Amino acid sequence: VTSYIGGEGHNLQEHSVILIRGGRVKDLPGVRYHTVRGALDCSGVKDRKQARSKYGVKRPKA
Amino acid sequence: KGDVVDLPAGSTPLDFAYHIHSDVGHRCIGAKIGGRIVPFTYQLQMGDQIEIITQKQPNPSRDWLNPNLGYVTTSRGRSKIHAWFRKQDRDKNILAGRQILDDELEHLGISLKEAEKHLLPRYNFNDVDELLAAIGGGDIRLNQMVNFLQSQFNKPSAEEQDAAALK
Amino acid sequence: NIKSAKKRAIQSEKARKHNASRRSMMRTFIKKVYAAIEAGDKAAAQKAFNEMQPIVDRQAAKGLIHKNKAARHKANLTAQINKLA
Amino acid sequence: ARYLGPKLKLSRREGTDLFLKSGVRAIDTKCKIEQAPGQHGARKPRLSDYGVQLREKQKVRRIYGVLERQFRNYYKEAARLKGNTGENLLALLEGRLDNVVYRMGFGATRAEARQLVSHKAIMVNGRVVNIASYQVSPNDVVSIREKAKKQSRVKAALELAEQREKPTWLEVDAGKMEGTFKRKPERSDLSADINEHLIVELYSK
RNA sequence: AAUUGAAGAGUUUGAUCAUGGCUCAGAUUGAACGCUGGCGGCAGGCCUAACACAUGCAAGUCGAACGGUAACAGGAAGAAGCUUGCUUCUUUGCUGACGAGUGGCGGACGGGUGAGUAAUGUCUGGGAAACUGCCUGAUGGAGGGGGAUAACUACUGGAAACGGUAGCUAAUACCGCAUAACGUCGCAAGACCAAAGAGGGGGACCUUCGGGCCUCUUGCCAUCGGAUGUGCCCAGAUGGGAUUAGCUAGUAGGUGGGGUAACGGCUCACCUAGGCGACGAUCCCUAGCUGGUCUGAGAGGAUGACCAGCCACACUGGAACUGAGACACGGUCCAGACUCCUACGGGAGGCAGCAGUGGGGAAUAUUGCACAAUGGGCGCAAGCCUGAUGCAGCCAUGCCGCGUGUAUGAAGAAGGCCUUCGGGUUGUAAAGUACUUUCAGCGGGGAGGAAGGGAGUAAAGUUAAUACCUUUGCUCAUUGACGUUACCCGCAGAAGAAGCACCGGCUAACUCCGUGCCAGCAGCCGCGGUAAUACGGAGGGUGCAAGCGUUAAUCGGAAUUACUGGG
RNA sequence: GCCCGGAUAGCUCAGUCGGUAGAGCAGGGGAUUGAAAAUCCCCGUGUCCUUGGUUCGAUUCCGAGUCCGGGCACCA
């Protein structure tokens, strides 16, 4: 399946190991799954401080 | 066998098999130490004796593990696993490789024999295993290879182009 | 496998041959009866019947053959022979 | 599992006193109550109907200090128990031990009555207890245990007992720091300021 | 008293009413994921690979069945070191007991798993053609012999696993003999059928001074019943496909023999030509069934994981033996694949038992402690085994509880954000002040789960018998895996205990800045094109709380399969 | 473990020979529109893997450290 990558910034490229959650875009007549940012080989979204559960970034230790 | 070998402080029993042999690491399915069987997560320490157990040859304990860079240690011995996988897909790649390769090989640069004498001593090559594996990966930096292909320069009238480049 | 209770196996074989013996024995006596029934020798067949009764029944109470099986034999055979008269 | 934050503002979300903060000051007058729970508290929202629902729930739950989940559990209790779902739910919440404690005047606030109860300070039917969600059974008694009997905060807090309307259903002697519960509070007995039927519907959706 | 309960919303249009789909609020999970994380009570935990599996444990037990004793402990006691009575050198089944072995019982229970299974299963209600060890009621018996094996030696094969030949021997092992009936067979008369002992003590009686004898206990064999379990037969119920319509030749009856514990094509031989099928046969696809769980107001729709009844399987395929009972999870024989040992002739093994490795996966734990509790196995028992079970460990995994503080505190502090810059707000929040100390933490104290069981004594029956023995009171020392228990008391100090989502409408809650159809959000409508309440950030806000989200999953809403309840 | 090579503006790519960092595509800019497209006129765009050393010129020399593609080799 084709699958969307939530948020800007994504180190993913070709191979890599990424988890897939349900849901869909509705804007990309095709995509029906989202990569799980902040989990596995997929990166947590860079510089996030709001609602990071989604995007999986750890709490800012700062 | 009484032998001992140094490792980074925080390794896994899997990795140890690689010092015995890269293929031995891939054979691994069973690990014991001091008669105590341990998970492929044990962090070896204090020169404690290993009691390896194996069978044949597969991606093994890192199949997804070290590939996931989680509890299989090192960026090194894992490379053997990495390529171990790759050569499979590479084989299929070498084939799809010759495919597209052949297209351009004679659509522009002409011949296989022409294409062969190219990469063999041009961009690092090693063997036709790799050269024909080139587009199942794009390793050489192809098209720069078509450039290595069209590396020939008769260019007399091409000077007339540069003159026109000024014109 | 591993059990000093594995002994049961050897003991059962030690029992099989024993059990098996009587079976063939019992069968032959029974056999002779049908053989005798073939002959039509109601008298001789009757005798064979007498020469099987103690055996089959003994084995029954002995536990080898049940007993209903025994009665079964004596029964249908008796039917065979009375009809043979 | 408690609000444990600026408790007074909750009064302004309701734009109403929730008796959350009694210790000294009469009118909160440090709140500018019923005017600004937040930066746009100055707003005057038409507030959706469902909003009145959610608001009522928040009111009562804020009052007893009861959190959502358990409160819902209570709701089902008001369902299968018997009689008017709303009324029962009310009396049941009143039945909360800590609520009975603050209602006995012990502790200046519901929460403070809890500060006592969790500290094993209270003894019902001559039996020490810690849990505040305790369901106070009919015709029981209770008294501050002697280890912290009448000490410090107590007497000032019980001095507050007079300022209130002093409940009918419960009993007290104070000399023994007694709290002899009797009948469960009547519907009219409670504050009545709340409209339980709303909440009834809320979960009845 | 034992059911008294049923909500709608967004969205097509310029707008409306229709029809009508898609989506949401709820309930819920054997969950995973992300962020986050205090403790506790209780439950739960490999849904995929019925994939392969190292190691340890998961079934042993009985001397009160037997010859014997391989060990230790003693006691008769040869002979010895010398403290001539200090131990000892040491011989001894002779006693407590017990290696190995024969025999009884158990291993067919317990535990696992859901592959197979569309009925040969299961659920329900029926029935007849049966068996049923252990337990039990009843009645009788329990006589009289003999022949072997193992053990054990000798020799001996073989690396091993594991046997070979020769003799030796016991038994509640085995096998005749006599004795049988309310037993079987038989119309009747007739015929046949079984088995044994062992243990405690104790008189006088009697010794080949083994003992016989007595009485107590139990074991033994038969037969009629009880109960329990088990096989079995029928009606109805028990998925999806007609883009599967014909399926069947042991097939459908009978007869006759055989076979089963028992009815029967259960199986053979001959005879009949039937048997099933649109109220779905056959075939294909999928699935273990149910009590139930889920949701729903109901009827229904989905599910059947934990606890429980049933069923089937036990590396794969197949068969049978022993036995009451298995066609046998940790038994056997055979074939296959597979792993291991090999002296390479030949052998060994099956975690889908508890844990545990690897593997697969989004994903699910400790190679823990224990026989103290119940239950089970054996033993008269005392006991022994018990990964049943009981507890502990492991993860917020579900449900539930409690805490992370309480009171005061206006100067509306600082800083932060908005400002129509004069303020508002953060916000009594903080600080500061005065308290309380559940749990954390430290140190004392400390029920219950414990009943039994052993020793003694008395009595009561038992007999000849004070005694053995059994029954009961009384007395003694005792038995806790968990467990520095639960619970309680003292202690120090607020000390160590708050995240997550959301904030355009649905739907609780707003502003400022950054970006400018880019970057990005999105469940539905949609937002983003240089003034965005929707993206990111801040503040503020709402909801929830040691959880919170996201996705997946079922039902509800959906009267969008309508029987209730539609066209 | 040793040996051999790849890393160049945002993407793809040029290079380079110890000497004074570019092409192409998107992208942004200006005209026009509310903002796009079409059309019209302009354009930039890189610590050369890092880093120091030989460096006036290293980007082409050199390892040290990076990842990346081959090859042999530890088979206890």
What are B28's strand-pairing partners?
B54
Same domain, D170 and D99: yes
Which alpha helices (H) appear in chain D, and where do they start and end?
9-13, 49-64, 68-80, 85-94, 97-103, 110-117, 153-159, 196-204
Query: What does this entry list as its resolution, in Å?
Result: 3.9
DSSP secondary structure, C17-67, as one string = HHHHHHHHHHHHHHHHHHHHHHHT-HHHHHHHHHTTHHHHHHHHHHTSS-S
Helix axes D85-94, D196-204, angle to 10 degrees: 110
Where on strand F do bases come within 7 A of a protein Cβ?
Answer: 1, 4-8, 12-15, 67-76
Sheet with D122-124, edge to edge strand ranges: D127-128, D122-124, D142-144
Residue whose token pair is 């640069």: B109
- On whether the CB atoms of residues D122 and D101 are closer than 8 A, the answer is yes
Q: Minimal Cα–Cα distance from B68 to chain A, Å?
A: 7
Burial class (CB in 10 A: 0-12, 13-18, 19+), A27: exposed
- What span, in angstroms and rounded, lies between the C-alpha atoms of C10 and C7? 5
Distance in Å, residue C39 CA to nucleotide E266 C1': 30
For position D162, which CATH number holds?
Answer: 3.10.290.10
Tokens representing residue D194 in the block: 């709340």
Residues D33-66 as b/e (b if ≥16 CB within 10 A, e otherwise) read beeebeeeeeeeeeeeeeeebebbbbbbbbbbbb
Q: Is residue D32 one of the residues assigned to a domain?
A: yes
Using only C-alpha atoms, what is the Rg of chain A? Answer: 12
* Contacts of residue C20, Cβ cutoff 8 Å, sequence gap at least 6: none
Q: B64 contacts in A (CB within 8 Å)?
A: 17
- Token output for A46: 């860079």
In whole angstroms, give the CA distance from residue C71 to residue C19. 20
* Other beta carbons within 10 Å of B40: 20
Among the listed residues B51, B59, B64, the one whose alpha carbon sits nearest the alpha carbon of residue B1: B51
**B77: which nucleotide lies closest, measuring CA to C1'?**
F1
Q: Are D195 and D145 found together in one domain?
A: no
Cβ of C21 near strand E (distance < 7 A):
no
Residue type at D175?
G
Number of domains chain D is built from = 2
DSSP A27: S
- Name the burial class of residue D187, with classes exposed (0-12), middle (13-18) and buried (19+) by CB atoms within 10 angstroms of its CB: middle
Contact B34, B25 (CB under 8 A): no
Range of the domain at D99: 94-180
Supply A29's token pair: 């007549």
Q: What does the domain layout of chain C look like in residue ranges?
A: 1-85
Nucleotide nearest to A27 (CA to C1'): E522
On whether residue D185 sits in a domain, the answer given is no
Specify whether D89 is located in the same domain as D121: no
**Cα–Cα separations (whole angstroms), residue D8 to A12, D15, D92, D109, D168:** 49, 10, 25, 12, 28
Q: Nearest nucleotide (C1') to the CA of residue B86?
A: F69
Contacts of D49 (CB under 8 A, 6+ apart): none
Q: CA-to-CA distance for D71 and D68, rounded, in angstroms?
A: 5
Residue D200 token pair: 């009834």
Query: Based on the domain organization, do D88 and D13 belong to the same domain?
Result: yes
| Nucleotides of strand E under 7 angstroms from a protein beta carbon | 3, 5-7, 25-27, 33-38, 54-55, 59-61, 100-104, 106-107, 130-131, 174-177, 183-187, 191-195, 221-223, 257-262, 321-324, 328, 330-332, 339-340, 349-350, 356-362, 367, 400-410, 412, 417, 424-429, 435-438, 488-490, 494, 498-503, 506-511, 519-526, 536-546, 548-553
Computed from CA positions of residues B11, B13, B16, B21, in that sequence, does the dihedral angle turn out positive or negative?
A: negative
Contact (CB<8Å) A40/B68 = yes
**Distance between A29 CA and the closest CA of chain B, angstroms:** 30
Asked whether residue D138 falls in the same domain as residue D116, the answer is yes
Same domain, D66 and D98: no
Residue D50 lies in a domain: yes
Of C29, C23, C6, C12, the closest CA to residue C60 belongs to: C23
Residue A40 contacts B where some CB pair is shorter than 8 Å: yes
Length of chain C: 85
Residue A57: closest CA among A31, A35, A39, A33 = A39
Do D87 and D128 reside in the same domain of the chain?
A: no
Task: Give the closest nucleotide to B7 (alpha carbon vs C1').
Answer: F1
- Orientation angle between helical segments C68-84 and C7-39, nearest 10 degrees: 10
Cβ of A62 near strand E (distance < 7 A): no
**Is residue D82 domain-shared with residue D130, that is, in the same domain?**
no
CATH number for the domain harbouring residue D85:
1.10.1050.10
Compute the distance between CA of residue D19 and CA of residue D14 in angstroms, rounded to an integer: 12
Cα(D113)–Cα(D129) distance, integer angstroms: 13
Beta bridge partners of B103: none
Q: How distant is the Cα of A3 from the closest Cα of chain B, in angstroms? A: 20
Phi first, then psi, for residue D135 (nearest 5°) are -95, 105
Residue D1 lies in a domain: no
Residue D14 and residue D88 in one domain: yes
Same domain, D57 and D131: no
